[PDB]
Design a binder for this molecule. Sequence first.
Ligand SMILES: CC(C)(C)NC(=O)N[C@H](C(=O)N1CC2(C[C@H]1C(=O)N[C@H](C#N)C[C@@H]1CCNC1=O)SCCS2)C(C)(C)C
Ligand SMILES: CC(C)(C)NC(=O)N[C@H](C(=O)N1CC2(C[C@H]1C(=O)N[C@H](C#N)C[C@@H]1CCNC1=O)SCCS2)C(C)(C)C
Lengths: 300, 300
Amino acid sequence: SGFRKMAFPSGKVEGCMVQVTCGTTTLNGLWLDDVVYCPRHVICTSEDMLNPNYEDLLIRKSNHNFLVQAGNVQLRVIGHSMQNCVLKLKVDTANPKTPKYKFVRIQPGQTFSVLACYNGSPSGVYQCAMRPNFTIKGSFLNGSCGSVGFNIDYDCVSFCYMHHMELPTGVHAGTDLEGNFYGPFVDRQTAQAAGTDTTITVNVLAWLYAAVINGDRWFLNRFTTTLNDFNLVAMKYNYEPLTQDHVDILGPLSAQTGIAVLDMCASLKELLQNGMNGRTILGSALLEDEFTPFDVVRQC
Amino acid sequence: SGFRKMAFPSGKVEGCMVQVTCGTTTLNGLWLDDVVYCPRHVICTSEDMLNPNYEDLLIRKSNHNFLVQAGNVQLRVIGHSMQNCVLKLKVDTANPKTPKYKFVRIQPGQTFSVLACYNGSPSGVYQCAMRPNFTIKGSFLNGSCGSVGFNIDYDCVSFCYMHHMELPTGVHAGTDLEGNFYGPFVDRQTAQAAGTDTTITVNVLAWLYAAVINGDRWFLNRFTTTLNDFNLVAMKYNYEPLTQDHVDILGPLSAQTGIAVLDMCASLKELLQNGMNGRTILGSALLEDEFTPFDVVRQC
Ligand SMILES: CC(C)(C)NC(=O)N[C@H](C(=O)N1CC2(C[C@H]1C(=O)N[C@H](C#N)C[C@@H]1CCNC1=O)SCCS2)C(C)(C)C
Ligand SMILES: CC(C)(C)NC(=O)N[C@H](C(=O)N1CC2(C[C@H]1C(=O)N[C@H](C#N)C[C@@H]1CCNC1=O)SCCS2)C(C)(C)C
């Protein structure tokens, strides 16, 4: 038993991390087959961060303006291409450690693991959820751009995120592996802000089920509720409305505990309305929403 | 910026995980050079879990009674030995993926990363602290015994933990990589329980420094305190007494923020005496004690 903020094993991604340097800017890149992927702001000059034209910036570059290094081995760039907000650098050598992989664009509320790297070297791994406002509350310092987020299904790594920038609120914004930003964010120093965030309702319910699986039942009640009445209450606490799709997803967890989804919703409505009364659930004094129903099943 | 429960990258350990089966018991082993390490309860039979004699059980075994599988290939056991509470299975094949490594026994309050594996396959990774009562609040299911905990210095893996059993309170017990249990625990089914735990004071203070580094100052105050007066209060909340060794260790964090260690102690004293007043620190409604001063510096 026990329940932890658990991340995926990171070895399949560690073997793909490289250092990418252009001009005076160094960040990380992802080396799959014979292509190194990295944020396109690597070619942004330190004087052109307000409104750079990346199409112009890149056409003015040659292959010898990109230095890629795998460990202590320099890779030779043999061509280059831009795809939305990321660069693709073709190299002489295919990465022999390339795992089976996919590029996946994820919905808000889904989780992934982040492999935090600096100068091509992994420093740590942690679990994130894509917030409803399309930001992530990550942990990134200078030189961390190009670090990636991912999931592993069986033996295939599904890359879903690459880090680009930190917002004024202390949260992080980035793209999928095809260069498309999550949310309304752009890679230039204009006025940008995270939208109003919301709490991921289906994840809180999944996590309450995890607590029941681990023998922790104090927060349940004899009551039930309709889905519509629950949503009327949940919205007052800035929770995502609960959909029938979410109810169906929680099905296997309901079956494991014997607690109908709407009964667990009534339990959450009581927790929201009254608080935890000084108690904790799975060691937390607040309602945790970074565990999906799939995370709960996989760990339990 | 940002601050996460960050674990070490796990690739160096993943390449060392194997499956060990003896009789009808399957668990994990750690394969370094030509030796596979695993809990000695792997030879404990059903219905002999109350008072097994492991010296007597092992002498009744041959090398061919141990099956070790790396990936999908068998290793040949060519010798065996017991060292305290773990078995060493010498095999014909040396692991080409053996990292630089140490075996380290750690003090309570220190943190390490846990690579949870089943049937030789890594499933996830998370961060733990050795609790003062020598248990860990981990996440382990059936078949997880033999999973290991570790730190990475530079490129060298310091293995500090191997999982053996779960206590009736829901917490876990195990050994160093030489088979010596942390705390007063034995691998036999007699009445054992976790002792009264305490909160790791020096880690809470380190984590409060991390909050200041990342912009949370609401919990600070203009007050200060003596070390003896602080310990008089902290003990009333089931906290570890703070030593001068701890104060010295917090030095670099005091220097980075400009907040004297004893000033931060006065801040923690206020937090213990009044609560958080509905606010959070680094996203937590609880005082977190699973970050050492070394972890705070690494992540900041
Ligand atoms: C745009 C907006 C106003 C929303 N904010 C910002 O401009 N923020 C900057 C930012 O992050 N930038 C700027 C660009 C590159 C990228 C970057 O290199 N950020 C570091 C990477 N490497 C990693 C940052 C630092 C800590 N945490 C992170 O993750 S993106 C635009 C064109 S240059 C700050 C450096 C945080 C001020
Ligand atoms: C002694 C004490 C009363 C304190 N507790 C226990 O007897 N606990 C058991 C225990 O863990 N045992 C039994 C032995 C081996 C070991 C084990 O096989 N533990 C699994 C391994 N693999 C992994 C367990 C499963 C759940 N979570 C874990 O981590 S140790 C004694 C001689 S056989 C339970 C199975 C949890 C009942």
